[PDB]
Amino acid sequence: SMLRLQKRLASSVLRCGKKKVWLDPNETNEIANANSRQQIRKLIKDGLIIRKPVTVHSRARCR
Amino acid sequence: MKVELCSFSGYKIYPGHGRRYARTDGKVFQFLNAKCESAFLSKRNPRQINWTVLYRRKHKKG
Amino acid sequence: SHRKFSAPRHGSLGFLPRKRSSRHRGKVKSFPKDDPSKPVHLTAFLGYKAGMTHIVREVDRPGSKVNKKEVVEAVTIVETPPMVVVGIVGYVETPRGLRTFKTVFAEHISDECKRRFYKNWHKSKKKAFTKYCKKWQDEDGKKQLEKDFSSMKKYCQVIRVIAHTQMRLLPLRQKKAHLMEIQVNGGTVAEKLDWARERLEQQVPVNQVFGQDEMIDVIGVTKGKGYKGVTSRWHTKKLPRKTHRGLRKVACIGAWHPARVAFSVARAGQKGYHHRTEINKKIYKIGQGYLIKDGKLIKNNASTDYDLSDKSINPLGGFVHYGEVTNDFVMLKGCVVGTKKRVLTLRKSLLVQTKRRALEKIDLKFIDTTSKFGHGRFQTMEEKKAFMGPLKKDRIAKEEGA
Amino acid sequence: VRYSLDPENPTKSCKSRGSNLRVHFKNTRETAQAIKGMHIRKATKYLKDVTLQKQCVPFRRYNGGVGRCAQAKQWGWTQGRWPKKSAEFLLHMLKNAESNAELKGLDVDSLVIEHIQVNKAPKMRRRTYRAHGRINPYMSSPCHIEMILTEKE
RNA sequence: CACCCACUAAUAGGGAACGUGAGCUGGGUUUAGACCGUCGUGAGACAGGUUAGUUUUACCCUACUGAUGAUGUGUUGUUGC
RNA sequence: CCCACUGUCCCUACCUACUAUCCAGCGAAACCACAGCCAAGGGAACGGGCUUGGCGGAAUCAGCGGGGAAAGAAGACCCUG
RNA sequence: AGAUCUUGGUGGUAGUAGCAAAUAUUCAAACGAGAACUUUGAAGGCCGAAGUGGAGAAGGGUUCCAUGUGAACAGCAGUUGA
Ligand SMILES: [Mg+2]
Ligand SMILES: [Mg+2]
Ligand SMILES: [Mg+2]
Ligand SMILES: [Mg+2]
Ligand SMILES: [Mg+2]
Ligand SMILES: [Mg+2]
Ligand SMILES: [Mg+2]
Ligand SMILES: [Mg+2]
Ligand SMILES: [Mg+2]
Ligand SMILES: [Mg+2]
Ligand SMILES: [Mg+2]
Ligand SMILES: [Mg+2]
Ligand SMILES: [Mg+2]
Ligand SMILES: [Mg+2]
Ligand SMILES: [Mg+2]
Ligand SMILES: [Mg+2]
Ligand SMILES: [Mg+2]
Ligand SMILES: [Mg+2]
Ligand SMILES: [Mg+2]
Ligand SMILES: [Mg+2]
Ligand SMILES: [Mg+2]
Ligand SMILES: [Mg+2]
Ligand SMILES: [Mg+2]
Ligand SMILES: [Mg+2]
Ligand SMILES: [Mg+2]
Ligand SMILES: [Mg+2]
């Protein structure tokens, strides 16, 4: 439903900002049950939570 | 029906169209529109502008 | 205290109710004074502002710098399909003014004319005049009509005829025609009644109403500019840039006394869409329109005595925002109020044209037909193709057409 | 409870009442005057049309500054508006009255709004701030509503 | 106000709360800072000079400009005076 | 004062953004003897009311700033105590 | 009945002024009675390291965190919230 807590926990555990945290919209129900960092780690391992890749800034023009 | 004129671009200028420009030195020119007059006023060569008649006859187009 | 310098008043006090026209047509309000010695003739007409262009002609005004010289004069094209007369109104003179005496409508009213009677033609049952026209057939209604004509003949002082335009002939969206009372003059009451009675259910071409190189009056409603401030509505002086609460205003709207605002103080409000009457407009050319006797003829609209080019009055690409003109058109001199596709009323001059401005013969030498949807540079398709030669789409169309 | 204007026959009639309804009182009054005397189905479809801005209510008494809309010409009036909140509140009240009419076991196909009344509810205080550190009231104007329907057809 | 330049047929005189600041401006007068000269012992003054110095609110009534309407003709429309 | 510069101006126009405008919701404040058509008269010597006369037609909208000797301070100028 | 009276209540104004300082939001989905404002994803942007980031002092004092509610408040709303 409202996964701000889950987003915060994922951002803290993954040690990345909330921008890079990807939560699966399909398994919203499964995520909402996770209220502990251990459960967040389990979801990360299962693949429901993905650390999105860093936005590309290429220096090829600069080079 | 009066005298037909030729512009910087070489087009015919019908009466009631364009403008007539006379310099101080003693030459009088006429331009079909503000585009042709502006091109003349930057001293742009007619032969290098693709849609001018002069460029067309220089490059044997058509 | 007096104002330190004198200055003419901004704005006209002859147009003070500066408000939108309550009518869209533009009514006559003053017809030419009748005289029975003249032949029976109409006095006015309905036109539509097709657009504007310019012409080349030689002036034959002696003693001027422009004698035997060629000038360029802007003109206005007014498309005027022949009016269809459907009725007659007779008026009787009273000490209380003119009042309507008796009205007669013709049978077989045109479908477009009947639409004027309906605000919503779409859902109508189309019943208008359906019971009325049946009295043109039975003997009782016929006798009633004959008594009506006799009463008009023996009582009415002036009469008018109702003519309507032909919407199907115009390229506009609106299919609702325009009705009009046109006064008939030049003869006795019986004579004009007989002439109109002949002309019921008939078409009156514009050439039978107005003539060449004759100066007429133009009536219409101007371009509605919407709500406007004082600066544009009255052309008063702008305030200095240091002005606090507004520079496009009038600084003083009246002295302390008489403790009110005089009507003559310029104030913001509606601009344009004003019913105006313009006079002294010379008719340079009355067009003939499109014919097909064997093929379509378009030269008659734009070819002059010295051009001889098979081209129409329609400019390259048609008239801006208007369409294509195929029917009888009138080429006035100068500007005409109202936008494109705005209905206009043209009337014979109420005055006597004795000035050498008037009654001067008009001979066109060249009529511009360049495209006004931009800076047009070619008179005709033929000349444009001749100058530019073949083109890429031309080549590819020839390729598929072999 | 003591309804104003009790019906002539309190057997063919049903009652609905509301108190402290968080709606504008003047808008409610104009709406109630608009729907007065209507059949219940006609009133319901009319309020739904108000919601969709297809039918406008004539603002007759409290018309200060109210703009002009074309649909006002249905009435002999010029000013009109489409109060959404008033429409929803009257819809809830009307459905409550319909439920009461069902409970009295009289058919709801024959109901006409013979009586309706809007009265100002007690005002509630809110606070605002002005240019020189001044405080102005930010009062609310709720309203109490009562109505009486009646079987007639 | 005055005067001059120039043009013009002519550059007449005035009123409307010495018209018109919820229209403007603030150059002057007429606060508080400050200098000069004159006066006074002094604080300070000077229709003497100079400089710098906050110009608020209209959504109310009415007026005025426009815009819907509104009264009767049964309704409604067209054309008109 | 001069060179240049330019919408300060001749002489105004157009365009953009936000407002104002209308709708949804929410929603005050100043002010208010009563109310608000004018001319003349008299009058506390400049009336919305009174007399004389001109007249006068529900409800309202967007403007507007002529009037309400508009509002804002028991005049700071001057005089008396 | 007055005292620009005191206290308290209520009107016209008026559903009016107004809710315009800092470029910008859109689609889909979910919960939910109810979604412009809740949450997720996608997109477009912005802050552009002298930040709309990360942390401290003074000051505040539980606002911190979880769960729950839609009475009041967050000048619209809110299933959200200091
Ligand atoms: Mg200023
Ligand atoms: Mg053009
Ligand atoms: Mg108002
Ligand atoms: Mg407003
Ligand atoms: Mg504030
Ligand atoms: Mg403060
Ligand atoms: Mg004078
Ligand atoms: Mg004065
Ligand atoms: Mg003033
Ligand atoms: Mg002022
Ligand atoms: Mg000054
Ligand atoms: Mg000083
Ligand atoms: Mg001394
Ligand atoms: Mg300074
Ligand atoms: Mg008076
Ligand atoms: Mg005093
Ligand atoms: Mg005092
Ligand atoms: Mg008392
Ligand atoms: Mg007393
Ligand atoms: Mg008191
Ligand atoms: Mg507002
Ligand atoms: Mg705002
Ligand atoms: Mg950036
Ligand atoms: Mg920081
Ligand atoms: Mg918290
Ligand atoms: Mg709120």
d(C-alpha D136, C-alpha D130), whole Å? 7
Q: Please report how many Cα atoms fall inside a 13 Å half-sphere around the Cα of residue C331, on the Cβ side.
A: 23
Contact present, B and A (at least 3 Cβ pairs less than 8 Å): no
Omega cis (within 30) before C258: yes
Share in percent of chain B as helix, strand, coil (round to 5):
25, 20, 55
Return the structure tokens found at C204: 């009156």
Please, which residues have CB within 8 angstroms of residue D153's CB and are 6 or more apart in sequence?
Answer: D109, D110
How far is the alpha carbon of B1 from chain C, nearest alpha carbon, in Å?
6
DSSP C247-286: SSS-S-S--STTSS--TTS---EEES--EEEEEEEEEEEE
Please, which residues have CB within 8 angstroms of residue C211's CB and are 6 or more apart in sequence?
Answer: C283, C286
| C373 residue type, one letter | F
C-beta atoms of C375 and B15 within 8 A: no
Return the structure tokens found at C150: 């006799």
Please, which residues have CB within 8 angstroms of residue C389's CB and are 6 or more apart in sequence?
Answer: B62
- Residue pair D120/D141 in contact (Cβ under 8 Å)? The answer is yes
For residue A16, the Cα-to-chain-centroid distance in whole angstroms is: 8
For residue D52, the Cα-to-chain-centroid distance in whole angstroms is: 17
For residue C95, the Cα-to-chain-centroid distance in whole angstroms is: 33
d(C-alpha C22, C-alpha C59), whole Å? 41
Return the structure tokens found at C171: 């390229």
Give me the sign of the Cα torsion angle B24, B27, B31, B36: negative
Q: Technique behind this structure? A: cryo-EM
The CA-to-CA distance between both ends of chain A, in Å, stands at 47
DSSP D62-82: S-TT--B-GGGGGTT-SBEE-
Return the structure tokens found at D67: 């703009």
Angstrom distance, C231 CA to F65 C1':
16
The CB density around residue D83, as the number of other CB atoms within 10 Å, is 23
Q: Which chains touch D (3 or more CB pairs under 8 A)?
A: none
- How many H helices and E strands in chain D? 3, 7
The CB density around residue C281, as the number of other CB atoms within 10 Å, is 20
Nearest to C101 by CA among C36, C149, C45: C149
Q: What is the b/e burial string over D106-121, where b = at least 16 CB atoms within 10 angstroms of the residue's CB?
A: bebeebbbbbbbbeeb
Please, which residues have CB within 8 angstroms of residue C238's CB and are 6 or more apart in sequence?
Answer: C231, C247, C248
- Write the residue in C54, C379, C389 that is nearest to B62 by C-beta: C389
Angstrom distance, A5 CA to G81 C1':
15
d(C-alpha C328, C-alpha C316), whole Å? 19
Residue C228 sits at the vertex; the CA angle it makes with C227 and C233, to the nearest 5 degrees, is 130
DSSP A20-60: TEEE-STTHHHHHT--SHHHHHHHHHHTSEEEPPPPP---T
Residue with tokens 């005027």: C80
Burial label for C121, CB within 10 Å (0-12, 13-18, 19+), is: middle
- How many H helices and E strands in chain B? 2, 4
Please, which residues have CB within 8 angstroms of residue C304's CB and are 6 or more apart in sequence?
Answer: C364, C365, C366, C367
d(C-alpha C49, C-alpha A37), whole Å? 79
d(C-alpha A33, C-alpha C119), whole Å? 66
The CA-to-CA distance between both ends of chain C, in Å, stands at 89
The CA-to-CA distance between both ends of chain D, in Å, stands at 27
Q: Are strands B5-6 and B12-13 parallel, antiparallel or unpaired?
A: antiparallel
3 state DSSP class of C299 = helix
For residue D67, the Cα-to-chain-centroid distance in whole angstroms is: 20
d(C-alpha C333, C-alpha C280), whole Å? 9
Identify all chain C residues contacting B33, using CB atoms and an 8 Å cutoff: 375
- Residue pair C114/C236 in contact (Cβ under 8 Å)? The answer is no
Element holding C344 (H helix, E strand): strand C343-348
Return the structure tokens found at C323: 């369409």
- Write the residue in B1, B16, B32 that is nearest to C54 by C-beta: B16
3 state DSSP class of D146 = strand
Nearest to C216 by CA among C156, C282, C150, C275: C282
Return the structure tokens found at C294: 């064997």
3 state DSSP class of C337 = coil
Return the structure tokens found at C259: 């403790």
C-beta atoms of B1 and C306 within 8 A: yes
Resolution of this PDB entry, in A? 3.7
Nearest to C167 by CA among C343, C345, C346, C298: C343
Distances (CA, A) of C286 to C301, C313, C331, C333: 9, 11, 6, 12
- The angle that helices C139-155 and C189-199 make with each other, rounded to 10 degrees, is 140
Residue D20 sits at the vertex; the CA angle it makes with D18 and D21, to the nearest 5 degrees, is 70
Nearest to C342 by CA among C298, C291, C276: C276
Distances (CA, A) of C59 to C65, C69, C72, C365: 10, 6, 10, 11
At residue D134, φ and ψ (nearest 5 deg) are -90, 150
Q: In this complex, is the C-beta atom of C248 within 8 Å of any C-beta atom belonging to chain B?
A: no
DSSP structural state of residue D125 = -
Return the structure tokens found at C258: 């008489």
Return the structure tokens found at D55: 């039918």
Nearest to B32 by CA among A9, C374, C13, C177: C374
Return the structure tokens found at C321: 């925002």
Ligand 9 mean position, distance from CA C251 (Å): 10
**Best of B4, B6, B14, B50 to mutate (most C CBs within 10 Å, chain C):** B14
Q: Please report how many Cα atoms fall inside a 13 Å half-sphere around the Cα of residue C31, on the Cβ side.
A: 19
d(C-alpha D97, C-alpha A4), whole Å? 43
At residue C153, φ and ψ (nearest 5 deg) are -65, -40
d(C-alpha D29, C-alpha D143), whole Å? 9
DSSP C121-147: STT----TTHHHHGGGTSHHHHHHHHH
Nearest to C277 by CA among C356, C217, C364, C363: C217
- Residue pair C28/C44 in contact (Cβ under 8 Å)? The answer is yes
d(C-alpha D39, C-alpha C132), whole Å? 42
Distances (CA, A) of C356 to C60, C61, C361, D31: 10, 8, 10, 71
Return the structure tokens found at C93: 């003179």
Bridge partner residues of D147 (DSSP): D16, D116
d(C-alpha C82, C-alpha C330), whole Å? 12
